[PDB]
């Protein structure tokens, strides 16, 4: 695609999310770069509006999947790529096992030279001292694959797929995710074979941080078509 050619190094981030969950509300903002040659994402999160008020990993999947590093020979099944500059929205419904469950709107597109991931987050029915709203989840996350399908009516793809958060107690929260993605322009895409994406999350803090904050390194790889 002529969309992959923006993809050739290092580019900036910028993610901006606004959350209202059960009624409080938040705001995110998120600065870093990434390279689709190795799909290495680097940014730093900060909760602008306070204390988050959820827990920072059950925010990852939703804080550009345009930065996946897909193989040479699996390029023309790159959808996210294919989409820009011009971009796409990404929806997803993440229900958490017994408690709430959020729904995300973002779009995901290049504002000049930074790609910008831009997301409206609501959720809702979250239990009072549960998981969520009491914070009872590891700050750390299991890394994880993801399927990845053509949406041929829709002129996009679709995914679901499962987070396990680690809950300290030792359970376990699983975060069952329902994604759509469709192009914001009229130009042609990339409609891809099965394959899947494979994932990995580092969370860490920065020590001269005084605010709620997450730093994040990720990788995310294209897989699942062979030669």
């Given at each position: ?60 999947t ?32 993440i229900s958490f096992k ?44 299991n890394?994880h694959n993801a399927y ?12 679901n797929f499962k987070i396990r958060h ?6 376990v929260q699983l975060a069952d995710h329902y ?49």
């Amino acid at each position: 695609s002529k969309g992959e050619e923006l993809f050739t190094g290092v580019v900036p981030i910028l993610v901006e999310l606004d959350g209202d969950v059960n009624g409080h509300k938040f705001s995110v903002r998120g600065e870093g770069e990434g390279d689709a040659t190795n799909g290495k994402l680097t940014l730093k999160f900060i909760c602008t509006t306070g204390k988050l008020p959820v827990p920072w990993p059950t925010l990852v999947t939703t804080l550009v999947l345009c930065f996946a590093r897909y193989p040479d020979h699996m390029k023309q099944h790159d959808f996210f790529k294919s989409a820009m500059p011009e971009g796409y929205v990404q929806e997803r419904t993440i229900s958490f096992k017994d408690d709430g469950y959020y729904k995300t709107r973002a779009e995901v597109k290049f504002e000049g030279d930074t790609l910008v991931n831009r997301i409206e987050l609501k959720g809702i029915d979250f239990k009072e001292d549960g998981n969520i709203l009491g914070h009872k989840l590891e700050y750390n996350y299991n890394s994880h694959n993801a399927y990845i399908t053509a949406d041929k009516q829709k002129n996009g793809i679709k995914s679901n797929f499962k987070i396990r958060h680690n809950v300290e107690d030792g359970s376990v929260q699983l975060a069952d995710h329902y994604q759509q993605n469709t192009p914001i322009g009229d130009g042609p895409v990339l409609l891809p074979d099965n394959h899947y994406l494979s994932t990995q999350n580092k969370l860490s803090k920065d020590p001269n941080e005084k605010r709620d904050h997450m730093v994040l390194l990720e990788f995310v790889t294209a897989a699942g078509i062979t030669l």
